[PDB]
Amino acid sequence: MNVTTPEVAFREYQTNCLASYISADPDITPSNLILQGYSGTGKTYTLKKYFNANPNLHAVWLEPVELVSWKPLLQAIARTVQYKLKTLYPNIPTTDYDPLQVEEPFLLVKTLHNIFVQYESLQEKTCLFLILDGFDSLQDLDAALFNKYIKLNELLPKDSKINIKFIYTMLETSFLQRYSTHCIPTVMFPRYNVDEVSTILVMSRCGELMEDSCLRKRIIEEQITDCTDDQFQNVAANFIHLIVQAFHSYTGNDIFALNDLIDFKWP
Amino acid sequence: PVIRKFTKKNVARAKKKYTPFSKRFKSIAAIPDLTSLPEFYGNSSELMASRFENKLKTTQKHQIVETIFSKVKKQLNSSYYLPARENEFASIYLSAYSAIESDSATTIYVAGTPGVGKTLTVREVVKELLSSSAQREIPDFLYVEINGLKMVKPTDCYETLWNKVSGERLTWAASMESLEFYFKRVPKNKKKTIVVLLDELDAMVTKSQDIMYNFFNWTTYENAKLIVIAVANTMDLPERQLGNKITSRIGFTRIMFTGYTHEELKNIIDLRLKGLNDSFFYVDTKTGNAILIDVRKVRLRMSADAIEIASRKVASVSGDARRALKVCKRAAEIAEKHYMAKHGYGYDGVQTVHITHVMKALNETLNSHVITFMTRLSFTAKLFIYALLNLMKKNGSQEQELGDIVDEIKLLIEVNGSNKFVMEIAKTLFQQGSDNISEQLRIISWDFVLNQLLDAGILFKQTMKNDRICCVKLNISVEEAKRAMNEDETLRNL
Amino acid sequence: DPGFGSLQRRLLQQLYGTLPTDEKIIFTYLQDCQQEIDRIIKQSIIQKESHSVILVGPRQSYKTYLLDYELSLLQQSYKEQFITIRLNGFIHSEQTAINGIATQLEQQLQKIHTISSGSLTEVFEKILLLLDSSITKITVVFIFDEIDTFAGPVRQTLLYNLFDMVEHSRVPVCIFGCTTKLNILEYLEKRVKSRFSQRVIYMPQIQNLDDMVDAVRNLLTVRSEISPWVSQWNETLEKELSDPRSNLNRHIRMNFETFRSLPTLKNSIIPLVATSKNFGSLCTAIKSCSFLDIYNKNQLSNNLTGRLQSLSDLELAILISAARVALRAKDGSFNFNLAYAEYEKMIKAINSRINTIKLWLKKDVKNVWENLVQLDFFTEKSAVGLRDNATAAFYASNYQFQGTMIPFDLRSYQMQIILQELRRIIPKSNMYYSWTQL
Amino acid sequence: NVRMMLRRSMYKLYSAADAEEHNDVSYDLSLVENFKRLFGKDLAMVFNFKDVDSINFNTLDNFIILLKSAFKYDHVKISLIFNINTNLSNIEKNLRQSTIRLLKRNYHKLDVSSNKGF
Ligand SMILES: Nc1ncnc2c1ncn2[C@@H]1O[C@H](COP(=O)(O)OP(=O)(O)OP(O)(O)=S)[C@@H](O)[C@H]1O
Ligand SMILES: Nc1ncnc2c1ncn2[C@@H]1O[C@H](COP(=O)(O)OP(=O)(O)OP(O)(O)=S)[C@@H](O)[C@H]1O
Ligand SMILES: Nc1ncnc2c1ncn2[C@@H]1O[C@H](COP(=O)(O)OP(=O)(O)OP(O)(O)=S)[C@@H](O)[C@H]1O
Ligand SMILES: [Mg+2]
Ligand SMILES: [Mg+2]
Ligand SMILES: [Mg+2]
Secondary structure (H helix, E strand, O other): OOOOOOOOOOOHHHHHHHHHHOOOOOOOOOOOOEEEOOOOOOOHHHHHHHHHHOOOOEEEEEOOOOOOOOHHHHHHHHHHHHHHHHHHOOOOOOOOOOHHHOOOHHHHHHHHHHHHHHOOOOOOOEEEEEEEEOHHHOOOOOOOHHHHHHHOOOOOOOOOOEEEEEEEEEOOOOOHHHHHHHOOOEEEOOOOOHHHHHHHHHHHOOHHHHOOHHHHHHHHOOOOOOOHHHHHHHHHHHHHHHHHHHHHHHHOOOHHHHHHHHHHOOO | OOOOOOOOOOOOOOOOEOOOOOOOOOOHHHOOOOOOOOOHHHOOOOOHHHHHOOOOOEOOOOOOOOOHHHHHHHOOOOOOOOOOOOHHHHHHHHHHHHHHHOOOOEEEEEEEOOOOOHHHHHHHHHHHHHHHHHOOOOOOEEEEOOOOOOOOOHHHHHHHHHHOOOOOOEOHHHHHHHHHHHHHHOOHHHOOEEEEOOOOHHHOOOOOOHHHHHHHHOOOOOOOOEEEEEEEOOOOHHHHHOOHHHHHHHOOEEEEEOOOOOOHHHHHHHHHOOOOOOEEEEEEOOOOOEEEOOEEEEEEEEOHHHHHHHHHHHHHHOOOOHHHHHHHHHHHHHHHHHHHHHHOOOOOOEEEEOHHHHHHHHHHHHOOOOHHHHOOOOHHHHHHHHHHHHHHHHHOOOOEEHHHHHHHHHHHHHHOOOOHHHHHHHHHHHOOOOOOOOOOOOOOOHHHHHHHHHHOOOEEEOOOOOOOOOEEEEOOOOHHHHHHHHOOOHHHHO | OHHHHHHHHHHHHHHOOOOOHHHOOOOHHHHHHHHHHHHHHHHHHOOOOOEEEEEEOOOOOOOHHHHHHHHHHHOOOOOOOEEEEEEEOOOOOOOHHHHHHHHHHHHHHHHHOOOOOOOHHHHHHHHHHHHOOOOEOOEEEEEEEOHHHOOOOOOOOHHHHHHHHHHOOOOOEEEEEEEOOOOHHHOOOHHHHHHOOOOEEEOOOOOOOHHHHHHHHHHOOOOOOOOOOHHHHHHHHHHHHOOOOOHHHHHHHHHHHHOOOHHHHHHHHHHHHHHOOOHHHHHHHHHHOHHHHHHHHHHOOOOHHHHOOOOOHHHHHHHHHHHHHHHHOOOOOEOHHHHHHHHHHHHHHHHHHOOOOOOOOHHHHHHHHHHHHHOOOEEEOOOOOOOOOHHHHHHHOOOOOHHHOOOHHHOOEEEOOOHHHHHHHOOOOOOOHHHOOO | OOHHHHHHHHHHHHHHHHHHHOOOOOOOOHHHHOHHHHOOOOOOOEOOEOOHHHOOHHHHHHHHHHHHHHHHOOOOOOEOOEOOOOOHHHHHHHOOHHHHHHHOOOOOOOOOOOOOOO
16 A cells, blocks of 8 residues: 565565555554464564554554563553653643553553543544564463453444554464454464575674674784685684584574574684 | 552442441430431432433434334333232232231241242232321331342342431441341330332342341341331242241241243233224324324234233243233234335334234244254364264264364265265365465364354363363254254265 | 555455445345344334344354444434443453443433442442433443353343343333354343343354355445546456356355355455555456465464474474374373483484484483474373463462473373374475384 | 562562662563663662572573563663572473573582581
């Protein structure tokens, strides 16, 4: 429509679907959206790049792993919504509602309605994106919390100028298959190959490795090295390739384990 | 200040006092006449209704059309002369009149099954007693009605009673001592008889027998003038709660309300339709408005056979009256819908209702909608049910493992690989029709059909995180599933 | 050209259904339910008559959609004669329901032209006095969602009061319940069921393929001249829904035989029309439908067989060894030591049969074991997963299971993929293939 | 549990900060995020586990993983002390592997006993 697609290395179709689903028009956008993928698959990176490519879209970021229950999650939502709405429009007079008053799901709906009532002097309807990045990582989780956040979008006002849309990022498949009857749009992030992991690892930890002080000390203790930059990058790439070819059978397709081994065996 | 370990920021507390009644008028000899006080016994408080009324009012009526059947539907609700209940009326009235006349206390217990009409006859008795008292034959009294399902906390009865006899607003405990003192020590020359109507009694005694014991015991005192009437479902409920000796000491009256028969129910239905049946109506052709006695003159008739069959069917199973009234109303509604549909009317000869309408309205409550639900399910769900039935026909265990179902489905698919339909459905079932998808392990749309069957109330699955040994079982018996499978064609053939 | 953008936006907002209520389209296979619901609501609102009814049907069967359509249709001719109150059974307990009802009643009554202040009992008695008790009244329309959670086996006190309000009152009331259970009538207790009106309407279901074809045609047909291309596109679709050999018909038939649900097809179609950049691209995409294959392939990219093709050699060998060990056991249980013993025996046999394959040590196989148990290939001996409700999880979180006290080497796991499935899936060119059967 | 340990730690931190400083908040990791705005200085939190041999290591591993999330705030500095009684071989064999790799970034082992050389 009127959105810009960023360029991600090996996530073309995911980026296309993301640009297809979410936009700035509340008339054409889904109320819910799930991104699924196991650890180290590249979902938060893609989502952050997509929002950084389009500055018009508004977003609020949460991480329901520091918060370890549902009451703190409700309070955090009720506080961050107010903070983001205040920092964006500063010329609209408003009162303040204490987030700690939110103790039940119904009270969250009441507080959100009261907050959204004030901003009724705006020109055209907008949409505010609430990203619950990590919904499956709550410590005390049961099979009933998601059923509330799915239906939370029906008790809110229907003709308000501020519309809220949710976006989840879920890890497992056994949990996700429980809610397969709801028919919610989904974008799945499959795991990586070995070539893709090698290229991503080089692209990430190639430039940063060379400004390390150890190699500078080792070359000032040594003689001249002409064609310095290209030779240095080649040395780094060769080291990364060697460590990958050595420990792929032990680390699997895990970016984090290889990224720790590289730092371990560099000095 | 201090740091709170947790906070309660949504606490709401009502303004109610704590001091009981036996601290107000000092000595017993200093108690004034409670009949003449302007706050006691509701002498002057008649403005609570006006506080909240007139809010749900508006000013518009666009000549609402009233079809012929609208009168019958209106005059057949459960709100609009007792034909059958006379012995119970006489017994209750005699007991209450004897209790009121001699200035004493008594307890009447009524037990029955839903829909008999115990509340209606008790209210009629109360109305007759009020009329007789207003006729200046017995001393005046007060009527207080307390329900059991219309209270948030079960201990809200006490204060309510006090709030209806004194005008004060106290907590429940202080209300208990206040009522105890009032019923025990206030002299009989400065009181007035009270008729409580404890209703749905089984919803109050669910943690302890305190409320029932107190309410029944307050009738034992000589100075009290209480007449308690308590209705309930089970007959021998106090015995199961209080004890044989306490009940023997109390000594109340017992009444049982038996169900209705197919004659009394028909009498009720016929009585509720007397003026309307076999009458004449002026009907405007353009709109459809009907007026009880250009335009036409029509009649409304209800066949007695329909009423008889409805009463016979309803009285056979339950004995209710609400259900019979609702069945007749639904038949009338169906006839009205057909009439307006045929004549092309809208909202804003001899028209009758046949036995066909009543039978159609009656069949809607007895039939079940499971066979029809399964005869329209997807192919995969029917395959799942077929595999489950096949496994049950071999193991005979009634509780099957899920991996066994998967293996049975795979074997069924791979053993019949010569029938045209299953020959051409294999690719769409295992690879979804494309050559770039690897062969799947379970089926296309496994979790979807599993959850679709589990949500509707057809399967029961225990909770285990291992998804290969989870046990599932049916919940609609076995013959219905067999019929649903047999109604198919491709599953029947193979 | 802006015409293509306008056409694309119109198609997207037609698919999502966000469209003015006077030009919405309703499928031909569920018009009878629409007419029945419309008759009930019109009788309740225009003619001031009380009603109670329950709607039963599977998830995403157009229950809320029809009610919202009816309310929006009636909220433009008679707006001063009714108010609406909606309750949801998932975010409303047996206590917060009273507060929600009071708040919504107050807000709607204020808007048309206190109650919510006090304790719970005061609010309950105030709303009871308000409801239970030319110039005409105002109808309050209740809309329940998931009514089966308010009909438990313990109290059932709100439904009793609401049905009593419907039965004996002077204020007309209409109440709609929504649930998915097929035997909702057996959840109500005796008195509540007696007060019920015994009126249940079952949502319709798709019976043929022509119904799905007609639904798709109604979805993807622009019927208002807004762009120069609307003349051609409306033609092109008609050439793909009439030909019985087109790819669109094949996909529709597959959905009919497997899923049988419009929302899934709608979700599949959305990116297909939102991705194309030019009119020719849209035409060729709807002619070939090659994007639906990619969508289907992705939707199956993390299932049980989609992970097995992203494993290294050592992980595959460990998985095969564990499956072999679990096959011989009586109840399928095993642990780390037996799996490693079988792995080392298999490696020694492979090496002796014949470059040499390295035999990784115990401490290096520990990481692979943890990686495999993370990816949901094994589960503990007898462990439940996620509890049904919050109280069960709270109870379970305060008890120390015996599985977290036994050392690492003796935890008893269970298998999730049997050996036959490994034999079916793994290609025959792999050097571990011969070891996948006993 | 994990949530209860988090609540105790946050309550102790807030009480100590308020005592040193001479409304109400939520006892979550979010209090770590907003510490600079609420007070003005930077944290140097020091944990101290006592009798680590009597703690079910699943909970301890989960808590360490949770505490890992506080490294993106630029003003906190977390330290850990383990009072091991027998030996660190049990610690190595009981914890997960990723957490051991995380702990091995920098550490110091000190032998503290009454009978060290008599
Ligand atoms: N497509 C990609 N192109 C370039 N770098 C990438 C790509 N995907 C991942 N990376 C890099 O690898 C890192 C992996 O971290 P993330 O992708 O953020 O992990 P994640 O999927 O968010 O993990 P979880 O789910 O939160 S545990 C990124 O921060 C990048 O540095
Ligand atoms: N003899 C009768 N004559 C007319 N209507 C009757 C008669 N008996 C019962 N009814 C009907 O029964 C309806 C229900 O009221 P009741 O029968 O008094 O209820 P109930 O016995 O209190 O039921 P519960 O509360 O479930 S035990 C009334 O509104 C009447 O229409
Ligand atoms: N207000 C609305 N306007 C347009 N389409 C809607 C609206 N509400 C829902 N839909 C869509 O209509 C289809 C089915 O309606 P739903 O309300 O989801 O069905 P349902 O049977 O009520 O589902 P429940 O609530 O889970 S039982 C889906 O595609 C919904 O996204
Ligand atoms: Mg992430
Ligand atoms: Mg009654
Ligand atoms: Mg709904």
